[PDB]
Structure 1
Amino acid sequence: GVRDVLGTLSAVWESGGTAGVGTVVRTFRSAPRPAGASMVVAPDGTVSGSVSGGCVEGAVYDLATEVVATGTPVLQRYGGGILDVFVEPVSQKTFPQLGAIRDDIEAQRPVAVATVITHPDAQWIGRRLVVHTDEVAGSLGSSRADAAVTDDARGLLAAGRSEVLTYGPDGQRRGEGMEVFVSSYAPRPRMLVFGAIDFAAAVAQQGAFLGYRVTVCDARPVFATTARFPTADEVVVDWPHRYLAAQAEAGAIDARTVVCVLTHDPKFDVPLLEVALRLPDIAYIGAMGSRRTHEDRLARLREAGLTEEELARLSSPIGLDLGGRTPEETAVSIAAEIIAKRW
């Protein structure tokens, strides 16, 4: 979200200065910039970031300037496409937690910021909560408000999603009049590819293209090699099931994590799938195979003790069934399946 311009925003913050920050909070009609996109105006008048495809930057720039002066935050609607921009003043006084959020982001700790952008009681506006998996700071001004937003915020966060939530003026689910924006900062989600066959390269590009960090992993050191996968974030040599087990235990995999089994060697894929099919959920567990391979794996897996409920979590054969033949088409059919299964 503010990731692009955060360095600039921090420098203002640390230096005791006050920045005008505008955040796209809602988009309609395919407005150029997604929800969360930011624009920051430094004390000296410099602006980094973008909120629109230039279409309303001038307006927002002025709005940000005025906001710093009055110190009153403002939700503004512009309207190709309709944009909702929240403009707020940001400084050590107005936002004490910003330094720590900056550190969370660097340290890869998920964190979310929930800001009231609409409320019948003008004083509520601009109040915010900083949410972690395990803790929460600040107050909206009501336990019931704080309680609901915290829960919803953690959910979005776990999913890495940014969104506007609506409530009654005191936090009632389903009522109306209070809206809050939740801006989630989760680290890049990861894709784990087990089996360093040539085809992994193709899988890894689709992963990169979708914004996953791809780890490629294989027990055979000839296969699992930086040289053969120069674009993968990381190449590892291990027993796939030992690697996966360890990431689980270290909390290095979360619910957006995606796993591809590109091996049908019984020495590997069965221990692997025993670990993977039993993990409190993660987004996707796919296994590459023709229809023959897929039926023989399922058999082996049943014989290994997997239950139908566990087996259900498995996407096999891998990919949507688009009819593709070349490996590139299989790779796209996989990417398509990943997207589909999360929406």
Structure 2
Amino acid sequence: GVRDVLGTLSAVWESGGTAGVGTVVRTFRSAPRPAGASMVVAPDGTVSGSVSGGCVEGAVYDLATEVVATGTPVLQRYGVGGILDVFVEPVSQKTFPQLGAIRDDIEAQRPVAVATVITHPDAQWIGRRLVVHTDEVAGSLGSSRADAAVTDDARGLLAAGRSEVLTYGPDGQRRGEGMEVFVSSYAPRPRMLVFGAIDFAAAVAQQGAFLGYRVTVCDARPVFATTARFPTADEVVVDWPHRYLAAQAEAGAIDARTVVCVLTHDPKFDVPLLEVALRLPDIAYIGAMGSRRTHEDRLARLREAGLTEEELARLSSPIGLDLGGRTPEETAVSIAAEIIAKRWG
């Protein structure tokens, strides 16, 4: 969402002024910028951020300028290469008192969603917002039923890191028509954890970085788990894999989008590791590398260790889509593709 232009927006907010903020809420026909793309017009007229590829920037700028004057938020559809819904609002300390706290949450890696009414029959509702955390909600949409419905749905989207327009009836009845709410999620970068610092881990970590994951490579062997060997990994740790995973779980440093790749079949490490991983309250993906021989030998060993067929059903083994690729690069792509397929973008 506003992460691109949040420093500039915050500085306006802190100074006491009003920014005009245009947020892309919905997109059709492959418009250039996605749900959450933001443009900010400072009181002195300076613009940052982008909502399109140039196509309607001038029009959004004028709208943002007009909206600051009237103080009335506006949903506008632009049609040109795509179709774009842009919601334009005045953001000040008066109109958005929580913005500083949200800036602070984004900085401290506390997940937070903002849910805004962008469409309603009663015009007084437009631009009302909820600030939603896991454990908390602030603000009011104007009705307990609306607050209840949106809070719930926003937390679900937040947990997934998703931003979307949800549609309700006027009192927040599900499947009703007439009220639309944009949920804009600010979740930290999801984690990819790679256990086994063999050379192939570098290829896995480059695909994880390409897909937007923060990648930790972890191996009990100091010679292997080295910054030099993995210079692009966000983090390289020397630990027993299962000790590291269990510690992340306990710290709440892993969430529902966390992705685990097991690149070892050393029984000393892989079984205790998968004993932990396969028992975690669900994380996005748990893959294990190996040929078909390694795969079946590992399954035998995991059954022998006490894993249930239901826990084993969580495991993607052998890892990746079967695309027929031979090289480490092809295998890395097959893994990234399976990860995407399992969550459905």
Q: TM-score range by the shorter chain?
A: over 0.9
CA distance in 1, matches of 2:172, 2:52: 31
CA distance in 2, matches of 1:6, 1:51: 15
CA distance in 2, matches of 1:282, 1:96: 34
How far 1:83 sits from its partner (Å)? 0.2
Post-superposition Cα deviations, 1:61-94, rounded to whole Å, max 9, x if no partner, equal 0000000000000000000010000000000000
Q: Secondary structure at the match of 1:4?
A: helix
CA distance in 1, matches of 2:289, 2:309: 19
Report what 1:203 is aligned to. Answer: 204
How far 1:171 sits from its partner (Å)? 0.5
How far 1:98 sits from its partner (Å)? 0.1
How far 1:26 sits from its partner (Å)? 0.1
Q: Secondary structure at the match of 1:228?
A: coil
How far 1:247 sits from its partner (Å)? 0.1
How far 1:174 sits from its partner (Å)? 0.4
Report what 2:31 is aligned to. Answer: 31
Report what 1:72 is aligned to. Answer: 72
Q: Secondary structure at the match of 2:280?
A: coil
Post-superposition Cα deviations, 1:122-163, rounded to whole Å, max 9, x if no partner, equal 000000000000000000000000000000000000000000
CA distance in 2, matches of 1:135, 1:221: 42
* Identity fraction in percent: 100
Q: Where do residues 1-343 of structure 1 align in structure 2 (5 Å cutoff)? A: 1-79=1-79, 80-343=81-344
How far 1:252 sits from its partner (Å)? 0.1
Post-superposition Cα deviations, 1:24-55, rounded to whole Å, max 9, x if no partner, equal 00000000001100000000000000000010
CA distance in 1, matches of 2:283, 2:221: 26
TM-score of the superposed pair, with normalisation by structure 1: 1.00
How far 1:188 sits from its partner (Å)? 0.2
CA distance in 2, matches of 1:179, 1:141: 14
How far 1:119 sits from its partner (Å)? 0.2
CA distance in 1, matches of 2:294, 2:258: 24
Aligned CA-pair RMSD: 0.2
TM-score of the superposed pair, with normalisation by structure 2: 0.99
**Structure 1: 4+ residue segments shifted above 6 A:** none
How far 1:305 sits from its partner (Å)? 0.1
CA distance in 2, matches of 1:73, 1:198: 53
CA distance in 1, matches of 2:32, 2:253: 33
How far 1:21 sits from its partner (Å)? 0.1
CA distance in 2, matches of 1:239, 1:119: 54
CA distance in 2, matches of 1:118, 1:331: 44
Q: Secondary structure at the match of 1:96?
A: coil
CA distance in 2, matches of 1:81, 1:47: 22
Q: Secondary structure at the match of 1:75?
A: strand
Q: Secondary structure at the match of 1:62?
A: helix
Post-superposition Cα deviations, 1:269-306, rounded to whole Å, max 9, x if no partner, equal 00000000000000000000000000000000000000
Post-superposition Cα deviations, 1:232-283, rounded to whole Å, max 9, x if no partner, equal 0000000000000000000000000000000000000000000000000000
Q: Secondary structure at the match of 1:183?
A: strand
Consecutive unaligned residues of structure 2, counting only runs of 5 or more, are: none
CA distance in 2, matches of 1:209, 1:125: 38
How many residue pairs get aligned? The number is: 343
CA distance in 1, matches of 2:305, 2:83: 55
CA distance in 1, matches of 2:38, 2:268: 49
CA distance in 2, matches of 1:317, 1:34: 34
Q: Secondary structure at the match of 2:233?
A: coil
CA distance in 2, matches of 1:191, 1:158: 16
CA distance in 1, matches of 2:95, 2:147: 19
Post-superposition Cα deviations, 1:150-206, rounded to whole Å, max 9, x if no partner, equal 000000000000000000000000000000000000000000000000000000000
CA distance in 1, matches of 2:143, 2:35: 27
Q: Secondary structure at the match of 1:289?
A: coil
Q: Secondary structure at the match of 1:335?
A: helix
CA distance in 1, matches of 2:10, 2:234: 28
CA distance in 2, matches of 1:231, 1:307: 37
Q: Secondary structure at the match of 2:4?
A: coil
